[PDB]
């Protein structure tokens, strides 16, 4: 009646298994779904918008919509090392590129 | 282990349930006592049945939990644990829907199935047992899926009966010759 | 002639509305009973074949 | 009585169902059914609603399986089950359905009488490939001067018609059976049209007008009219083509000629249109389909001339396209323009004009070369493609009301006769043999020599007069379909000695 | 079969029902929702799934409360057909509105059905003629035929359809079907005085017309219905007393746009424009039931009002495709003081494709075509330039031309008194002799107002003497 | 390859969502393949939607597909066999003939997907090219690492332009070509294929001086989109590692995008401006950056484009104007009149076109030319309104220049023995220039202006005004 | 809306509500949607020309796309003789000031 389609089947087997996130998914985010050039990642809630996130297949990304189940990052990197159920670790700078 | 998705409505709960329930040790026990505990939160006198739908917090509905598993604190550790995620996204009108769907992944791990044979009038009870031997004697029973033969009347079914259990169905309803009989007889 | 055409169509809906007729009364006796048993016992011979 | 043979035949079946998984129906309505169950579904098969009707499935989750239901709908409920039939869709092909009206199913919706199958065959029979192939080079024939000479069509190709609502749509199709009667009496079998004309859209009236033209004109005993009209179904519809496709498949593979004539291949992306949205599935460019174009490709390429190795047949393709107010730049007109070789435009002004049905000669390509009709008409037509290119330019400058060179006036006097002699009334034939002489007469200004308002009976007298007087000039150009210096000779000699009368 | 049930939503006018036994209505029945306003009546359209029906509601919507009974007809609502409906007007349902009490009838039928096929289809080219010059000249009108007419907005559009029920309803059929689809309340009341009038009505007796109306102001399900009640009473005259018939529309319009606005709601995604997906099959029933059979012969005559002066629109556009002839009126053409406001260059008909009705006719008419369009193409020259500025020839031309358009406005015999002419009829025989003359140029010297407002030739002679005073 | 199974839930169209088992899931670009009868379908991955789901868009006949049936995946994106037999053959998507020569033979295997050279690797050298074909010659010369963009109507002459094109330069050049047909008809497959196969572009040895790769329009969007792709790997293995210069064509690459815009609306996406697919620039830009100019070999695309009626100010060809180096229109109105080849000197242009890079006197010439033709045709509204009579006397000459010049435009082409019937001609590249500043100079100008009209050089025009004359 | 308002029969009292709806459109548009809704609901016209405006006459009424077919009978005989044909001779004056100018 009253869910979100962020209530995914490898995230909710863990949730019931009282198996709770424990910074692993709240810190850094791990991906639920990719689509469409669009991750989408369960986690990331210390972001700032735009902050810069590290993939596991070398990927970079930016954040453009953060949203409370998934947060959707938007590639910078191609999609074909990018595939479901990875580890995405926060660099925790938002983008800035060198001046002088 | 997941047995393969079963559902699209509210069945994610029930696949994850049922292999949590598979590393509890007892998926019989789980059903069993979520099965009392649903039926005692339906049949509520008062606001059990005045309200089912969500019209109360996350906050409000926490507490009402606290309640439901003093009245049966048997209930195993995971099941109660699926009264959290329930209260949390705040679903509760699907809260037997994923028990009855948490009962066909347990139903089939038993090695049970459930037959329905549309009737038109309550049948001969010898009707049922030379069917159930049929069925087992043939080769749609092997045995690991034991049949109740469940006789419904329904006025969907006028004559006849029709043959229901599985993926298989054998008609030999009346009212599809009826149909036809009054189609070709007009020309 | 139109009539004609016509009433070899009512003469077909005669027919047609005695189909109704009769499955009031199959349906009204124990023939009702008795029939449905000879699909029964059919019913154990299809089944018995798959 | 006519009652008791039907009991009889009703009494003697028996039901008994046996498949490979039910389903119970859980939505209905809105023309397009949605059961529940039905997980094992092969994509595209037939499954039997109760009810008495039959639909196909075009959609399968492991949800809600979209069964698009024909006819009837109205006695399609919930409640009900569906049993599959064990059948992907196939139509009866053969020698049966000549001179017989037949829906998408291939049941006759006229009674003419019964179908004889020599096969059965699928309403999806995959398009020939480069192997089978050979080139195109027979002549296709409208007895109409301007298709023939400017834009013209072979057999194993697609020219694209493209037009009007309903105007002279019906004619263009008639011209083109009127005067291949003649050849397919004739000696050569491999001369002999077995046309196939598809309906989708239409009304049942302007069909049984047609066929009643075509009775006494005494071409319905080889035409075949494939019908899905406004009243049968939205999946019918959209089904037609598809199978009015594989009967024209099964007369190229026989070493007989076909030409299947698709009207309107814009009201099949209107009946997919109501499919799509029904099934939620997202439209592309303008509201219809997203893979619409896919559905128009696979079926146009079913017009191949094959190899002696194959077939000596070949099947022909003529698209329609009728425009909802003229526009070509439409996703619908713009895929089809991609598919075929040729634009046979249809303007609105030149209809009423006088040439009908009216053939544009200002838009309109033909990428084929001029061997695709026969040698004499093409060198007599020589120069006919740059008269009436001319002729359009020197007239633009020309309208103003401003006055110009003499050289400029010869061109546009020379375009004026051409484009009279082009215009012919619709319903009328008039073989090749003798449309050689009138535009190497044209060409020739020997039409120009004489005023434009009797250039109808200078034609009509030209004509009667080569019957009587030379008769060999004729034979040798129905024969052999070509001309040399002895008979261009001869019918620039001919022409002059009775050049007006 | 007596079903009852409680009302689960009401959501708009796409009301649901929650069927609380396990017997269950088909598509296409009927129901009656019980309230103190008396019946509300709707149409089962979808099956949702355990027992719930989505009803179109064909009476309006207020007052209702979700938990209520519903009662199950057993099927499409029954309008009364018969010999005893003539001379009467009828509801969506079959209530007098005329309320000279309750309708006897013999027979009463359900309004769906299904269309007669292609088999039974048997379709004449047998003529009729109206005595109205522009008529004959550019697509004549047919017995067995399905004419069509796009009409203005509601400033000439029925003025043309009342000189035709004068001319067409007094010289063919035994009856007449009049079904005016979400009309205004205004041409309803002038019509059924006007027929009275006329004597076309005798409420005594058993009359030669019936009457469906339905307002424009009722909710959008019950119009499209009024369409379907209308169809039954041409259905009884078809086939059960097997006699010609006609019928008349004087909107069918509405039908289109009321198909539109339920279909969003129901679940069919609306397609572009704001028009529905289901478009071609709904209205096709309707063109196929419509037609002309091998018992009785139903000639309609058919008044679509084009909406914003486009006829590209879905709705215009797929009406074109049902009819055998078309005289399409521009809303323009009648603005300019020009009635009738068919445009000349744009009418059409399969009952005149070149010698169909009389070589000579069509020859005669073909001509008048090529004329009126070099017109048109210099119509453009004329103005951005002068005209004195052309050649002798082409200005000849385009005075015929003129003349030719000028004539062609015809007043009316009914609305005589509004155009402020005294009217006019023309006979078949008489336009091919007016319009001969014209092309040859014996009259191509009296002046361009004597065209104006005149029938037949002779009229013009006459006229120029009248201008000349 | 491994066993690796996923099983099928629901097929809506092209697009099949199958149920990958935990930890061997795909991965976006990867190749699944499921056994049939109507070969092996192969699933381009195309989205991961999670719960071990994976969707994806089919590229091959899905007609009576059972769902459940077992789905094995590959391990990477669709690979072809890729060597020097694929020289002289018809090739589809998957590698494999449609003309049956058997199974290709490898030497290397590679994905069709690939990544074009970054920017280090980039660089903008050039070869002036010479097609033997003087407006092509003057106005817009061709040049290595071509980017050429071919735009024209549908059946102007387009075919017969692109035939002649192979015919004269692949064979003579020491490079070899690879043809690719992307969603194109088997009318045309077997036509082009038979008719060179006469002039010896394809040889009957193995080895050719050309490919054919044809996927073709009655089969699935998705081999379609992928068709393209095929063609342009070929041409990257010859690139480097054989370490050679060839001349790319596909035809037409509008069908290319044609193909995008199915698949986009079907995956989910909305669409975007006058119904195109999102993706349409990130695309053409992977497309069009693998063909360039490396430290090795050297690719020349060749690119037929059709503008869908005549409209190229949609933005689908308009943005893909600027992405194709050397634009060329090849309009209708110029076919209608006679005038063979179909192109417009106005809208013919390349990345070299003017300095002594070209030479001096090439870009000299050719503005001279453009010029005399534009004030003919400002002056055509003046000559048919005005009159021609009332302007000067050096107006006049400048006229009966630019129709002098007009038609000398014209030639016939060596495929063009039934689109013309008058075998080709071969005008190289100074030739043209030296002929054209003639016309210019007055010196032919007793030349009539009917007597440039289907010749080739200056030579053969001063001769066939001697016929013409008797 | 507009069917809400009629004039009732000598039995209701002879009711009447005359309604002369209000409409604001931009360009002297008739090929747009909401203006044709209108005038196809309704009867005559009662157009306003801004030419017309400026040029004299407050408020100006633009009697070329004036039409009435719901008055033609309303006025009484006073009011129809001195006004005799006056409608159908700048009908006269409309076909004469095209080409005057």
């Given at each position: 009646?009253?869910?979100?389609?962020?209530?995914?089947?490898?995230?909710?087997?863990?949730?019931?298994?009282?198996?709770?996130?424990?910074?692993?998914?709240?810190?850094?985010?791990?991906?639920?779904?990719?689509?469409?050039?669009?991750?989408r990642?369960?986690?990331?809630?210390?972001?700032?918008?735009?902050?810069?996130?590290?993939?596991?297949?070398?990927?970079?990304?930016?954040?453009?919509?953060?949203?409370?189940?998934?947060?959707?990052?938007?590639?910078?990197?191609?999609?074909?090392?990018?595939?479901?159920?990875?580890?995405?670790?926060?660099?925790?700078?938002?983008?800035?590129?060198?001046?002088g | 282990?997941?047995?393969?998705?079963?559902?699209?409505?509210?069945?994610?709960?029930?696949?994850?349930?049922?292999?949590?329930?598979?590393?509890?040790?007892?998926?019989?026990?789980?059903?069993q006592?979520?099965?009392?505990?649903?039926?005692?939160?339906?049949?509520?006198?008062?606001?059990?049945?005045?309200?089912?739908?969500?019209?109360?917090?996350?906050?409000?509905?926490?507490?009402?939990?606290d309640?439901?598993?003093?009245?049966?604190?048997?209930?195993?550790?995971?099941?109660?644990?699926?009264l959290?995620?329930?209260?949390?996204?705040?679903?509760?009108?699907?809260?037997?829907?994923?028990?009855?769907?948490?009962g066909?992944?347990?139903?089939?791990?038993?090695?049970l199935?459930?037959?329905?044979?549309?009737?038109?009038?309550?049948?001969?009870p010898?009707?049922?047992?030379?069917?159930?031997?049929?069925?087992?004697?043939?080769?749609?029973?092997?045995?690991?899926?034991?049949?109740?033969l469940?006789?419904?009347?329904?006025?969907?079914?006028?004559?006849?009966?029709?043959?229901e259990?599985?993926?298989?169905?054998?008609?030999?309803?009346?009212?599809?010759?009826?149909?036809?009989?009054?189609?070709?007889?007009?020309? | 002639?139109?009539?004609?055409?016509?009433?070899?169509?009512?003469?077909?809906?005669?027919?047609?509305?005695?189909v109704?007729?009769?499955?009031?009364?199959?349906?009204?006796?124990?023939?009702?009973?008795?029939?449905?048993?000879?699909?029964?016992?059919?019913?154990?011979?299809?089944?018995?074949?798959? | 009585?006519?009652?008791?043979?039907?009991?009889?035949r009703?009494?003697?079946?028996?039901?008994?169902?046996?498949?490979?998984?039910?389903?119970?129906?859980?939505?209905?309505?809105?023309?397009?059914?949605?059961?529940?169950?039905?997980?094992?579904?092969?994509?595209?098969?037939?499954?039997?609603?109760?009810?008495?009707?039959?639909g196909?499935?075009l959609?399968?989750?492991?949800?809600?399986?979209?069964?698009?239901?024909?006819?009837?709908?109205?006695?399609?409920?919930?409640?009900?089950?569906?049993?599959?039939?064990?059948?992907?869709?196939?139509?009866?092909?053969?020698?049966?359905?000549?001179?017989?009206?037949?829906?998408?199913?291939?049941?006759?919706?006229?009674?003419?009488?019964?179908?004889?199958?020599?096969?059965?065959?699928?309403?999806?029979?995959?398009?020939?490939?480069?192997?089978?192939?050979?080139?195109?080079?027979?002549?296709?024939?409208?007895?109409?001067?301007?298709v023939?000479?400017?834009?013209?069509?072979?057999?194993?190709?697609?020219?694209?018609?493209?037009?009007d609502?309903?105007?002279?749509?019906?004619?263009?199709?008639?011209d083109?059976?009127?005067?291949?009667?003649?050849?397919?009496?004739?000696?050569?079998?491999?001369?002999?049209?077995?046309?196939?004309?598809?309906?989708?859209?239409?009304?049942?009236?302007?069909?049984?007008?047609?066929?009643?033209?075509?009775?006494?004109?005494?071409?319905?005993?080889?035409?075949?009219?494939?019908?899905?009209?406004?009243?049968?179904?939205?999946?019918?519809?959209?089904?037609?083509?598809?199978?009015?496709?594989?009967?024209?498949?099964?007369?190229?593979?026989?070493?007989?000629?076909?030409?299947?004539?698709?009207?309107?291949?814009?009201?099949?992306?209107?009946?997919?249109?109501?499919?799509?949205?029904?099934?939620?599935?997202?439209?592309?460019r303008?509201?219809?389909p997203?893979?619409?174009?896919?559905?128009?490709?696979?079926?146009?390429?079913?017009?191949?001339?094959?190899?002696?190795?194959?077939?000596?047949?070949?099947?022909?393709?003529?698209?329609?396209?009728?425009?909802?107010?003229?526009?070509?730049?439409?996703?619908?007109?713009?895929?089809?323009?991609?598919?075929?070789?040729?634009?046979?435009?249809?303007?609105?002004?030149?209809?009423?004009?006088?040439?009908?049905?009216?053939?544009?000669?200002?838009?309109?390509?033909?990428?084929?070369?001029?061997?695709?009709?026969?040698?004499?008409?093409?060198?007599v037509?020589?120069?006919?493609?740059?008269?009436?290119?001319?002729?359009?330019?020197?007239?633009?400058?020309?309208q103003?009301?401003?006055?110009?060179?003499?050289?400029?006036?010869?061109?546009?006097?020379?375009?004026?006769?051409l484009?009279?002699?082009?215009?012919?009334?619709?319903?009328?034939?008039?073989?090749?043999?003798?449309?050689?002489?009138?535009?190497?007469?044209?060409?020739?200004?020997?039409?120009?020599?004489?005023?434009?308002?009797?250039?109808?009976?200078?034609?009509?007298?030209?004509?009667?007069?080569?019957?009587?007087?030379?008769?060999?000039?004729?034979?040798?150009?129905?024969?052999?379909?070509?001309?040399?210096?002895?008979?261009?000779?001869?019918?620039?000699?001919?022409?002059?000695?009775?050049?007006?009368? | 079969?007596?079903?009852?049930?409680?009302?689960?939503?009401?959501?708009?006018?796409?009301?649901?029902?929650?069927?609380?036994?396990?017997?269950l209505?088909?598509?296409?029945?009927?129901?009656?929702?019980?309230?103190?306003?008396?019946?509300?009546?709707?149409?089962?359209?979808?099956?949702?799934?355990?027992?719930?029906?989505?009803?179109?509601?064909?009476?309006?919507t207020?007052?209702?409360?979700?938990?209520?009974?519903?009662?199950?007809?057993?099927?499409?609502?029954?309008?009364?057909?018969?010999?005893?409906?003539?001379?009467?007007?009828?509801?969506?349902?079959?209530?007098?509105?005329?309320?000279?009490?309750p309708?006897?009838?013999?027979?009463?039928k359900?309004?769906?059905?299904?269309?007669?096929?292609?088999?039974?289809?048997?379709?004449?080219?047998?003529?009729?003629?109206?005595?109205?010059?522009?008529?004959?000249?550019?697509?004549?009108?047919a017995?067995?035929?399905?004419?069509?007419?796009?009409?203005g907005?509601?400033?000439?559009?029925?003025?043309?359809?009342?000189?035709?029920?004068?001319?067409?309803?007094?010289?063919?059929?035994?009856?007449?079907?009049?079904?005016?689809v979400?009309?205004?309340?205004?041409e309803?009341?002038?019509?059924?005085?006007?027929?009275?009038?006329?004597?076309?009505?005798?409420?005594?007796?058993?009359?030669?017309?019936?009457?469906?109306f339905?307002?424009?102001?009722?909710?959008?399900?019950?119009?499209?219905?009024?369409?379907?009640?209308?169809?039954?009473?041409?259905?009884?005259?078809?086939?059960?007393?097997?006699?010609?018939?006609?019928?008349?529309?004087?909107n069918?319009?509405?039908?289109?746009?009321?198909?539109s606005?339920?279909?969003?709601?129901?679940?069919?995604?609306?397609?572009?424009?704001?028009?529905?997906?289901?478009?071609?099959?709904?209205?096709?029933?309707?063109?196929?039931?419509?037609?002309?059979?091998?018992?009785?012969?139903?000639?309609?005559?058919?008044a679509?009002?084009?909406?914003?002066?486009?006829?590209?629109?879905?709705?215009?556009?797929?009406?074109?495709?049902?009819?055998?002839?078309?005289?399409?009126?521009?809303?323009?053409?009648?603005?300019?003081?020009?009635?009738?406001?068919?445009?000349?260059?744009?009418?059409?008909?399969?009952?005149?494709?070149?010698?169909?009705?009389?070589?000579?006719?069509?020859?005669?008419?073909?001509?008048?075509?090529?004329?009126?369009?070099?017109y048109?193409?210099?119509?453009?020259?004329?103005?951005?330039?002068?005209?004195?500025?052309?050649?002798?020839?082409?200005?000849?031309?385009?005075?015929?031309?003129?003349?030719?358009?000028?004539?062609?406005?015809?007043?009316?015999?009914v609305?005589?008194?509004?155009?402020?002419?005294?009217?006019?009829?023309?006979?078949?025989?008489?336009?091919?002799?007016?319009?001969?003359?014209?092309?040859?140029?014996?009259?191509?010297?009296?002046?361009?107002?004597?065209?104006?407002?005149?029938?037949?030739?002779?009229?013009?002679?006459?006229?120029?003497?009248?201008?000349?005073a």
């Amino acid at each position: 009646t009253k869910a979100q389609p962020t209530e995914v089947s490898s995230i909710l087997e863990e949730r019931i298994k009282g198996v709770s996130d424990e910074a692993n998914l709240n810190e850094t985010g791990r991906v639920l779904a990719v689509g469409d050039g669009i991750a989408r990642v369960f986690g990331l809630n210390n972001i700032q918008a735009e902050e810069l996130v590290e993939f596991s297949s070398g990927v970079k990304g930016m954040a453009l919509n953060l949203e409370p189940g998934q947060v959707g990052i938007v590639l910078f990197g191609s999609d074909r090392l990018v595939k479901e159920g990875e580890l995405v670790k926060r660099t925790g700078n938002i983008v800035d590129v060198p001046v002088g | 282990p997941p047995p393969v998705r079963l559902f699209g409505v509210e069945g994610t709960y029930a696949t994850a349930l049922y292999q949590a329930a598979a590393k509890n040790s007892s998926i019989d026990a789980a059903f069993q006592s979520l099965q009392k505990v649903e039926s005692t939160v339906k049949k509520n006198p008062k606001l059990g049945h005045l309200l089912l739908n969500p019209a109360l917090s996350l906050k409000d509905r926490n507490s009402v939990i606290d309640a439901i598993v003093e009245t049966h604190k048997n209930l195993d550790g995971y099941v109660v644990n699926l009264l959290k995620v329930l209260s949390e996204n705040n679903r509760l009108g699907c809260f037997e829907k994923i028990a009855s769907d948490f009962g066909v992944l347990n139903d089939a791990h038993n090695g049970l199935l459930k037959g329905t044979v549309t009737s038109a009038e309550p049948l001969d009870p010898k009707s049922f047992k030379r069917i159930e031997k049929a069925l087992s004697a043939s080769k749609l029973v092997g045995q690991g899926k034991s049949l109740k033969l469940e006789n419904v009347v329904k006025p969907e079914i006028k004559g006849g009966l029709i043959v229901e259990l599985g993926d298989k169905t054998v008609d030999l309803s009346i009212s599809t010759k009826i149909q036809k009989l009054n189609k070709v007889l007009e020309d | 002639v139109r009539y004609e055409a016509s009433l070899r169509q009512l003469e077909q809906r005669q027919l047609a509305k005695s189909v109704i007729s009769r499955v009031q009364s199959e349906l009204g006796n124990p023939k009702f009973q008795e029939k449905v048993l000879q699909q029964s016992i059919s019913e154990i011979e299809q089944l018995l074949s798959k | 009585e006519v009652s008791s043979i039907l009991e009889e035949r009703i009494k003697g079946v028996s039901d008994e169902a046996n498949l490979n998984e039910t389903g119970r129906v859980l939505a209905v309505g809105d023309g397009i059914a949605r059961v529940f169950g039905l997980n094992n579904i092969q994509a595209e098969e037939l499954v039997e609603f109760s009810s008495g009707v039959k639909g196909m499935a075009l959609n399968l989750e492991p949800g809600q399986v979209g069964i698009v239901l024909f006819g009837s709908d109205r006695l399609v409920k919930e409640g009900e089950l569906v049993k599959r039939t064990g059948n992907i869709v196939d139509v009866p092909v053969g020698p049966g359905l000549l001179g017989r009206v037949v829906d998408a199913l291939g049941n006759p919706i006229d009674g003419k009488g019964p179908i004889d199958a020599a096969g059965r065959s699928r309403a999806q029979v995959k398009a020939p490939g480069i192997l089978p192939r050979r080139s195109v080079h027979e002549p296709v024939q409208t007895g109409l001067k301007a298709v023939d000479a400017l834009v013209p069509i072979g057999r194993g190709q697609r020219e694209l018609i493209i037009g009007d609502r309903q105007t002279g749509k019906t004619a263009v199709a008639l011209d083109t059976i009127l005067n291949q009667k003649r050849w397919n009496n004739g000696s050569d079998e491999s001369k002999k049209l077995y046309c196939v004309y598809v309906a989708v859209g239409q009304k049942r009236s302007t069909v049984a007008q047609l066929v009643q033209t075509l009775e006494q004109h005494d071409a319905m005993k080889y035409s075949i009219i494939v019908a899905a009209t406004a009243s049968e179904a939205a999946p019918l519809q959209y089904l037609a083509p598809f199978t009015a496709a594989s009967i024209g498949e099964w007369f190229r593979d026989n070493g007989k000629h076909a030409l299947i004539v698709y009207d309107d291949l814009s009201k099949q992306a209107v009946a997919y249109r109501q499919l799509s949205l029904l099934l939620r599935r997202p439209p592309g460019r303008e509201a219809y389909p997203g893979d619409v174009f896919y559905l128009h490709s696979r079926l146009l390429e079913r017009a191949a001339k094959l190899s002696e190795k194959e077939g000596s047949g070949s099947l022909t393709a003529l698209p329609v396209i009728e425009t909802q107010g003229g526009d070509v730049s439409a996703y619908i007109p713009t895929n089809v323009i991609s598919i075929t070789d040729g634009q046979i435009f249809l303007e609105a002004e030149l209809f009423y004009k006088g040439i009908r049905p009216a053939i544009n000669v200002g838009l309109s390509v033909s990428r084929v070369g001029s061997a695709a009709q026969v040698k004499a008409l093409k060198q007599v037509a020589g120069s006919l493609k740059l008269f009436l290119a001319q002729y359009r330019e020197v007239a633009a400058f020309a309208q103003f009301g401003s006055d110009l060179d003499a050289s400029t006036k010869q061109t546009l006097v020379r375009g004026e006769r051409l484009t009279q002699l082009l215009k012919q009334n619709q319903y009328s034939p008039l073989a090749t043999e003798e449309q050689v002489p009138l535009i190497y007469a044209g060409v020739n200004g020997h039409l120009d020599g004489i005023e434009l308002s009797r250039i109808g009976e200078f034609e009509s007298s030209f004509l009667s007069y080569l019957k009587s007087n030379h008769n060999e000039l004729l034979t040798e150009i129905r024969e052999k379909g070509e001309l040399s210096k002895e008979l261009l000779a001869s019918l620039k000699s001919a022409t002059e000695s009775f050049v007006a009368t | 079969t007596p079903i009852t049930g409680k009302v689960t939503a009401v959501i708009g006018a796409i009301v649901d029902v929650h069927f609380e036994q396990s017997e269950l209505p088909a598509i296409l029945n009927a129901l009656e929702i019980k309230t103190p306003q008396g019946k509300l009546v709707l149409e089962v359209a979808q099956h949702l799934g355990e027992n719930t029906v989505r009803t179109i509601a064909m009476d309006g919507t207020e007052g209702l409360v979700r938990g209520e009974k519903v009662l199950d007809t057993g099927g499409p609502i029954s309008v009364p057909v018969g010999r005893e409906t003539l001379g009467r007007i009828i509801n969506v349902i079959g209530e007098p509105i005329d309320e000279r009490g309750p309708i006897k009838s013999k027979l009463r039928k359900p309004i769906h059905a299904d269309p007669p096929s292609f088999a039974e289809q048997s379709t004449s080219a047998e003529i009729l003629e109206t005595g109205i010059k522009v008529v004959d000249l550019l697509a004549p009108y047919a017995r067995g035929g399905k004419i069509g007419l796009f009409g203005g907005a509601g400033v000439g559009k029925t003025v043309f359809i009342q000189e035709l029920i004068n001319n067409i309803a007094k010289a063919h059929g035994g009856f007449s079907v009049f079904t005016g689809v979400g009309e205004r309340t205004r041409e309803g009341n002038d019509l059924y005085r006007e027929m009275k009038e006329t004597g076309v009505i005798n409420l005594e007796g058993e009359s030669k017309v019936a009457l469906v109306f339905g307002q424009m102001n009722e909710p959008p399900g019950a119009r499209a219905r009024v369409a379907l009640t209308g169809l039954t009473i041409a259905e009884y005259f078809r086939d059960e007393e097997g006699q010609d018939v006609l019928l008349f529309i004087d909107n069918i319009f509405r039908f289109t746009q009321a198909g539109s606005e339920v279909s969003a709601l129901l679940g069919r995604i609306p397609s572009a424009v704001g028009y529905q997906p289901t478009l071609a099959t709904d209205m096709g029933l309707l063109q196929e039931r419509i037609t002309t059979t091998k018992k009785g012969s139903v000639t309609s005559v058919q008044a679509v009002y084009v909406p914003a002066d486009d006829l590209t629109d879905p709705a215009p556009a797929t009406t074109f495709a049902h009819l055998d002839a078309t005289t399409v009126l521009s809303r323009g053409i009648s603005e300019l003081g020009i009635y009738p406001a068919v445009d000349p260059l744009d009418s059409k008909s399969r009952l005149l494709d070149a010698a169909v009705v009389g070589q000579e006719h069509y020859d005669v008419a073909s001509k008048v075509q090529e004329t009126l369009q070099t017109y048109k193409s210099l119509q453009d020259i004329i103005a951005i330039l002068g005209m004195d500025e052309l050649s002798e020839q082409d200005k000849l031309t385009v005075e015929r031309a003129r003349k030719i358009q000028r004539f062609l406005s015809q007043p009316f015999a009914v609305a005589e008194v509004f155009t402020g002419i005294p009217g006019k009829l023309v006979r078949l025989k008489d336009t091919v002799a007016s319009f001969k003359a014209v092309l040859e140029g014996k009259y191509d010297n009296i002046p361009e107002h004597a065209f104006y407002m005149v029938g037949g030739i002779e009229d013009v002679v006459a006229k120029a003497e009248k201008l000349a005073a």
